Amino acid sequence: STIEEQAKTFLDKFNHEAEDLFYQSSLASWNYNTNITEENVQNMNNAGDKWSAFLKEQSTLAQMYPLQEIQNLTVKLQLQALQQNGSSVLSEDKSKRLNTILNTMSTIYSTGKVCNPDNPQECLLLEPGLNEIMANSLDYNERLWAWESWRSEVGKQLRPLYEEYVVLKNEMARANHYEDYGDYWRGDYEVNGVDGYDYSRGQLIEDVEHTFEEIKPLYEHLHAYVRAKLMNAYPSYISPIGCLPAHLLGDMWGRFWTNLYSLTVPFGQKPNIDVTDAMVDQAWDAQRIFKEAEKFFVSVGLPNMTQGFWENSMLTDPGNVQKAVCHPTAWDLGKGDFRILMCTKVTMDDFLTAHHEMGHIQYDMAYAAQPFLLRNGANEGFHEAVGEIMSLSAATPKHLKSIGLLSPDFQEDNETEINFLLKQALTIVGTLPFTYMLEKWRWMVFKGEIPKDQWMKKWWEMKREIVGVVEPVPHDETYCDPASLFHVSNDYSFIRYYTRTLYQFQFQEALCQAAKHEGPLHKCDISNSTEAGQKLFNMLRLGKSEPWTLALENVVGAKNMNVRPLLNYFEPLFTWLKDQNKNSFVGWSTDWSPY
Amino acid sequence: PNITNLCPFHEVFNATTFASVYAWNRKRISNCVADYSVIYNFAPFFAFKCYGVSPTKLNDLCFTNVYADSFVIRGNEVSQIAPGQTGNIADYNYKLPDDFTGCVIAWNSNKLDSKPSGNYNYLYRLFRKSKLKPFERDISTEIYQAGNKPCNGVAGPNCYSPLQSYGFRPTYGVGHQPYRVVVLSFELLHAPATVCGPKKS
Ligand SMILES: *[C@@H]1O[C@H](CO)[C@@H](O[C@@H]2O[C@H](CO)[C@@H](O)[C@H](O)[C@H]2NC(C)=O)[C@H](O)[C@H]1NC(C)=O
Ligand SMILES: *[C@@H]1O[C@H](CO)[C@@H](O[C@@H]2O[C@H](CO)[C@@H](O)[C@H](O)[C@H]2NC(C)=O)[C@H](O)[C@H]1NC(C)=O
Ligand SMILES: *[C@@H]1O[C@H](CO)[C@@H](O)[C@H](O)[C@H]1NC(C)=O
Ligand SMILES: *[C@@H]1O[C@H](CO)[C@@H](O)[C@H](O)[C@H]1NC(C)=O
Ligand SMILES: *[C@@H]1O[C@H](CO)[C@@H](O)[C@H](O)[C@H]1NC(C)=O
Ligand SMILES: *[C@@H]1O[C@H](CO)[C@@H](O)[C@H](O)[C@H]1NC(C)=O
Ligand SMILES: *[C@@H]1O[C@H](CO)[C@@H](O)[C@H](O)[C@H]1NC(C)=O
C-alpha cells in the first residue's frame, strides 16, 4: 500500500525473473566460453540481449519508486543498483555514437598490429609478440623501437577517439547526476545513510593520497635498488640521480615489475620455492590440485565444494577439436551453480591460481543467500583481495611442508625470504604508483583540471614525479600514451587494483592475528584456524548488503583503508633495502638526466 | 485374517506427474491396511521428519483418516514444510498447523522434474493478500494488486500475476533442484478408526 511495500513486492518479482534470465544468460556465456562455435555465439548473443532488454524495462519500471521515502537499507541498495540509467540517459544518436566509439576502440586495441619498417610481409600483434619482447629482451634500442612504435601508431589512431570518448562519458555522468566520469567511477565506494560508516565519493582521492604518502619511502628504496641493478644491466643509459627509462620496466606500460626478478635478484645463488618438480614427480593432476585447495578451505572452516561444481566445471583443457577460452575464471551462474573455468596445467602457479579462484567461489557461495542485486563484493576491491589472501597463505613454506610438496628438512634462511619478498615487492609495491598515477590522471582529465592540449605534458610530468619513470623522447598531443593500456582503452575502472592491494594485506594481518601467528607476517598461514575462517566468513556472507566499511570493520577492526599491514608485511625487506642503499641515492629527480 | 486391501501408497509416492505447490494434491486414505514399509523403501529421503508420532509405532497405531498431500517445491523450501515456519511456501502455498500430527517426506526429483530448456509447469504462489490457514489451498489466478490503482485484470505496472514458475534445470544447485514432498496427516475422529496396520499369526 505504501511505496516501501510496493518496492518490496516489485523487488521480489524482479529477483525471481532476474535469477531465471540471468541463469540462462550465464549458461549461454559458459557454453560459448567452453565451446567456441557459432551457434553458441548466437545463443550467447540472444541470451545477453534478452537479459539487457529485461534489465532495461525493469529499470524503467524501477525508477517509479523514489528513494527518499524508503527506509530499509537492503531495499534502498537494490533499488539504487537497479535505477541506474547507464548510457540510456543520452539521446539515441549520441548513445549510438558512444557504442560505436567503444566498439572501435576495442577493435583497434585488439587488432592493433605494429611491425618493423622495410619488412611488411607479416607483422606482429600486441598479445602474442609485444609482451614477449617488452618482457624478456635485454636490448635497449629494440625495446625502444617496439615501445615508441606501438605508442605512436595506437596513439595517433586513438587520440581523437579518446577526445570524443571523454566528452561523451562526461555528458553521461553529468546527466546521471554525477560531477564527472571520475566521480561516476568513484561512486562504487560511496556509502550513504549509515551512521558512523559513511563514505563519500570525494573522500577516496585523499585516502589514496594519504596511503601513498606512506607507501613512498618503501617504493623509493625499491626504486633505487631496481635502478642500481638496471644500471648493472644497462651501463650508460640510466642515470644515478634520474628516473627509470620507460621502456625498461619489464612490461609494455610499466604496470608490473615482476619481469625484473632476473636482473634485480638479491641472492641469485639461492633457489626459489618452486614446487612444480614435486607435483610432477608425485603425479598431481588438476583434480587433486583443486581437492587440495578444497582441503585448505575446509581446514580453515569454510564449506566444501558443491556436487555441481565437480560435475559441471571444466578444470582441464578439453582438446584441439573443441576450442575454449583459456582465461582462469570463477563463474557464479546462480541458482546454486558455481563453476571454475580453468585450463589447469601442473605448475606451482596454477596451484596458487586454483586457490585464488576457489577463494572467489567461496566468496560467491557465502553471499548466495542474499538478494540477486546484492550478490557481489562490498566494493570492487574485496572480491580479488579474498582470493589473493588465499594465494598468499598457500604459497608459504609452512603450507608447502604441511602438504608434502616441500621437504621437511628445508631450511628457511633469511636470504630466500629476502628473495621472496623482493619478488612480491616487484609485483605488488611496483604496481601501486602506476595505478595511483593512472587513476589520478584519469580523474583529472575527467574533472577538467587538465587542459585538452596539455594531456601528455601533464601525464609524463606525473610519471616523473610519482612513479619515477621518465619518457625516452618527448611526446606532443598527437599521441595518446595512456590509451595503449587495456583497461583505459576499453572503459574500465583502475583504482580497484590499489584498493585490492591494500585490503589484501589488511585481511592478512587480521586473519594472522586471529590465528595466533608468532613470526613475521609473510610466513603466516591461516590453515587449521577456524576462528580466522569464522572472522573472514562474517564478511563473506554479507555480500553487498552492508557497507564496505562495515565489512572491513568485521575483519580488521578498522573502517578505512590502512597501509600499515602492507608496510608491516615488507618490513624485513624494508630494513634490507635501507641497508643496501647506503652507497646509492634514494629518490629521483624529475630532470631528463638518463634520457 | 488374510492381509489384503493395502492402502494405495504406491500411487502417491510414485505418480508420473505431481502437482504444483499452489494447487497441491490431497488424497484421502480410508478403509484399507496401512503398510508404511513401502513408504520407507521407496527412495532415499532428504527428510522424514515426523511431528507428533514416532516413525516406528505407526504400523501398530490405527487412525481414522490419513491425508496424503503431494506437491513439488525447491530444495531450499523443504525446511518450510514444518509447523511454525515462514516463507513463501509456508505463508502462501502450504501451511501446517502448530499441533500437526504426521510426517513430512521429501526426496530429490531431478531425473523427473528437470528439463534443460527449463521446466515451466511447476508453479508457486508468490503474492497473496493474506497468509494461508492450515490445510488451505488457493487456486485463484487473480492479478495481485500491489499498489493503489485497480489492476482491471490486465497485467501492468504494480499489478503482478501471482503464480510464478519454478524454472527447474538439471544443472541447478542442490538448494534449487526440484523436490517432491508428500505430507502424511493422521486424524482421529469420533468415527471408528478404519486405517490400521497388518496383523499376523
Ligand atoms: C533515468 O531516466 C529517466 C528517463 O529520462 C528519468 O525519468 C525522468 O526524470 C525526470 C526528472 O525527475 C522527470 O522530470 C521525468 O518526468 C522522468 N520521466 C519518466 C518517464 O519517469 C529518471 O529520473 C532517470 N533516473 C536517474 C537516476 O537518472
Ligand atoms: C592441520 O591439521 C591436520 C590434521 O591434524 C595436520 O595433518 C597432520 O600432520 C601431521 C604432521 O606430523 C601428520 O603426522 C598427520 O598424519 C597429518 N594428518 C592428516 C590427516 O593429514 C596438518 O599438518 C595441520 N596443519 C596444516 C598447516 O595443515
Ligand atoms: C561443443 O559444440 C559442438 C557443436 O556441434 C557439440 O557437438 C559438442 O557436443 C559440444 N561439446 C560439449 C562438451 O558440449
Ligand atoms: C528489510 O527487509 C528485509 C526483507 O526484505 C527484512 O528481513 C529486514 O529486516 C528489513 N530491515 C529493516 C531494518 O526493517
Ligand atoms: C565435507 O566436509 C566435511 C567436514 O566439514 C568432511 O567430513 C567431508 O569429508 C567433506 N566432504 C568430502 C567429499 O570430502
Ligand atoms: C642472515 O642471518 C645471518 C645470521 O645472523 C646474518 O649474519 C646475515 O647478515 C643475515 N642476512 C640478511 C640478508 O638478513
Ligand atoms: C515406481 O517408479 C519407477 C520409476 O520408473 C517404476 O519403474 C516402478 O514400477 C514404480 N513402482 C510402482 C509400485 O509404481
Author numbering:
A (entry chain D): 19 to 613
B (entry chain A): 330 to 530
What does the publication say?
Local refinement enables visualisation of the XBB.1.5 RBD - hACE2 interface at 2.8 Å resolution, permitting unambiguous placement of P486. Inspection of the P486 mutation reveals that it does not alter the conformation of the loop region within the hACE2 binding ridge, compared to BA.2 or WT RBDs when bound to ACE2. Additionally, P486 does not restore the hydrophobic hACE2 contacts made by F486. We note that while the density for the M82 sidechain is strong within the BA.2-hACE2 complex (consistent with ordering due to interactions with F486), there is weak density for M82 in the XBB.1.5-hACE2 complex, suggesting that the side chain is flexible and not participating in an interaction. In the absence of any additional hACE2 contacts afforded by P486, and the limited angular degrees of freedom intrinsic to proline within a polypeptide chain, it is conceivable that the described increased hACE2 binding affinity over XBB.115,16 is due to conformational stabilisation of the hACE2 binding ridge loop region in an hACE2 binding competent state. When compared with the hACE2-BA.2 structure, alterations in local contacts made by XBB.1.5 RBD residue 493 are apparent. R493 in BA.2 establishes a salt bridge with hACE2 residue E35 and displaces hACE2 residue K31 away from the RBD interface. Q493 within the XBB.1.5 RBD sits within hydrogen bonding distance of hACE2 residue H34 and accommodates space for hACE2 residues E35 and K31 to extend closer towards the RBD interface, with E35 positioned in hydrogen bonding distance of Q493. These alternative hACE2 interactions made by Q493, along with the potential stabilising effect of P486, may contribute favourably to the hACE2 binding energy to compensate for the loss of the R493-E35 salt bridge and the hydrophobic interactions made by F486 with hACE2 residues M82 and Y83.
The XBB.1.5 variant of SARS-CoV-2 has rapidly achieved global dominance and exhibits a high growth advantage over previous variants. Preliminary reports suggest that the success of XBB.1.5 stems from mutations within its spike glycoprotein, causing immune evasion and enhanced receptor binding. In late 2022, a recombination occurred between Omicron sub-lineages BA.2.75 and BA.2.10.1 resulting in a new variant XBB.1 and its further sub-lineage XBB.1.5, the latter of which rapidly became the most dominantly sequenced lineage in the United States. We find that while the XBB.1.5 maintains a high binding affinity for human ACE2 as similar to previous variants, it has a diminished affinity for mouse ACE2, representing a departure from earlier SARS-CoV-2 variants.
